[PDB]
Structures are given as structure tokens and as C-alpha cells.
Design a protein around this ligand. Structure first.
Ligand SMILES: [Mg+2]
Ligand SMILES: [Mg+2]
Ligand SMILES: [Mg+2]
Ligand SMILES: [Mg+2]
Ligand SMILES: [Mg+2]
Length: 210
DNA sequence: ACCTGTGACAAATTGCCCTCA
DNA sequence: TCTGAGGGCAATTTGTCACAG
DNA sequence: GACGGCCCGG
DNA sequence: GTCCGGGCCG
């Protein structure tokens, strides 16, 4: 399946995207990389076959993701850009044409890489973010270990405000996304908490490949 | 005040179904 | 007939906060 | 809608 | 009987 590669600056950027939008974004990065001006395209029926959707639900996902890009911004730590500089539009039935901010090109191409089949069954977008950040530290053989700071996780993945309370962070984000990765990717993930006084400050992730 | 977990409720998202150009 | 653009749904997951200990 | 392949009239 | 361009139907 297609080999996604991306600059670590994108892996570590601060933004808020849905699952459907992240799925589309992987294909944009792939199109761009095979070369330019920044104009990309998406076909409904190919999208449907890639992610095992019907044509109808594919159409619904593309259309609403596309209208949900408006006003979205990307921050590279500290410079913010919009993803799109023109509305999406359809020249032909079943075909969408998109105008990515050409100023984003160099941020796409010290790098992270993974095959698309590794992530295409993940449902929760925060788990996609986590699996990307872990891939950034992976070894040829397939293992790695990394310590991520909680405040940096919250700022980078733009987690919602109630997850500033640690028990909610545990219950609705960490446990769910670790259990997702272990069930939906070829990765096998464990973790332990690092503390300072009563506060938990980092999470230490270890993983190997099956 | 700080920390933890759980019970509830609300809001959002998922894979469905159907209909017609 | 095959595609895809619309219009809906119920079950489930995610986001929030009161309260116990 | 868009596309193909069938069957009408001449 | 056959042959061809085109329209409609699925
Ligand atoms: Mg969908
Ligand atoms: Mg889950
Ligand atoms: Mg303290
Ligand atoms: Mg008791
Ligand atoms: Mg007390």
C-alpha cells in the first residue's frame, strides 16, 4: 500500500482535524510528494475502495470534510497558516479539486514514515496523532521507546479542555487510543506514567512490531 | 486546597438505509 | 444498470462535571 | 446523471 | 433477408 512520508514538523504541528480530513490529507501529501503548484484531486470511487466504503458514504465523508476545512489553521512551533486558500469545487461528477496553500509544500517534504494500511482502520483521530508521533521514533526492526510531555500532547493534538483533569485524560483519551492501536494496527504498545510530586508530567511509551 | 475513580448526562460520530437524477 | 448526491436513523463513542474517598 | 449496447425505422 | 446511424432505456 502507499508509503506515507512526512516532515517531523507536520508530525509535531498543532492542529485539529477529523478522521475523514486526516484520511484525505494523507492522499494530498502523497500526490504532492510524487513530483509544482499545489492543486490536488480526489476521486469518490477510489476513496471508497481504499477505505472499504460504499460510494454514497464516501461522497458524504468527502463533502462534509471539505466544507469543514474553512477557517482551519496549522501552527508550526510559532507560525500559523490556513490549509486552503480557495474553496473546494467539482469539475466532474465524482471528482473534487482542491487548492492547498502552496506555502505548506516545504513543511510536507528528520522525517516520519508509515504505510497507509497501518492507519486506515483507526477511528479516533487522536489515536492517529499518537500513532504518527510514535512512528517518528520507530527503528528499522520495528520497536521504539519515547517519553512525551503531557502539556505538549495537549497543546499539539489540541485535546479538549476537560482533559486538563488527569482522570478524564486517562479515561477518555489515553486508554482508548492505546487500546485502539493494539487492536487495529500491527503495533503492540505499553506505557508507564512519570510523576513529580503528586502531578503526572510525562507518559513513556514502549512498542515493538508483530 | 490537592490527588484519584466512577456515575450520569449531553453532544457528537459511526455504520446503516432509502430515493431519485 | 452503475454512480453518486441528497435525505434520514439508532447504537455507540466522546466531552463534561458532580460527588465519594 | 452518465454510459453502453440493443432495437427501431428506412 | 441484411446494414447503418442514432435514440432511449436500463
Ligand atoms: Mg462516513
Ligand atoms: Mg475505541
Ligand atoms: Mg500539588
Ligand atoms: Mg463506600
Ligand atoms: Mg474529605
Amino acid at each position: 500500500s502507499p508509503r506515507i512520508v512526512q516532515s517531523n514538523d507536520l508530525t509535531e504541528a498543532a492542529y485539529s482535524l477529523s478522521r475523514d480530513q486526516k484520511r484525505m490529507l494523507y492522499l494530498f501529501v502523497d500526490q504532492i510528494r510524487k513530483s509544482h503548484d499545489g492543486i490536488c484531486e480526489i476521486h469518490v470511487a477510489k476513496y471508497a475502495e481504499i477505505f472499504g466504503l460504499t460510494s454514497a458514504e464516501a461522497s458524504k465523508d468527502i463533502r462534509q470534510a471539505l466544507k469543514s476545512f474553512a477557517g482551519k489553521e496549522v501552527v508550526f512551533y510559532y507560525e500559523s497558516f490556513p490549509w486552503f486558500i480557495k474553496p473546494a469545487h467539482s469539475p466532474s461528477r465524482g471528482l473534487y479539486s482542491v487548492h492547498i496553500n502552496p506555502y505548506l509544500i516545504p513543511f510536507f517534504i528528520r522525517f516520519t514514515q508509515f504505510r497507509l494500511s497501518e492507519t486506515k482502520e483507526i477511528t479516533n483521530p487522536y489515536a492517529m496523532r499518537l500513532y504518527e508521533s510514535l512512528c517518528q521514533y520507530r527503528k528499522p526492526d520495528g520497536s521504539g521507546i519515547v517519553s512525551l510531555k503531557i502539556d505538549w500532547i495537549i497543546e499539539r493534538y489540541q485535546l479538549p479542555q476537560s482533559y486538563q483533569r488527569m482522570p478524564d485524560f486517562r479515561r477518555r483519551f489515553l486508554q482508548v487510543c492505546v487500546n485502539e492501536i493494539n487492536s487495529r494496527t500491527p503495533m503492540r504498545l505499553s506505557y508507564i506514567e512519570k510523576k513529580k510530586g503528586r502531578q503526572t508530567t510525562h507518559i513513556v511509551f514502549s512498542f515493538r512490531d508483530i
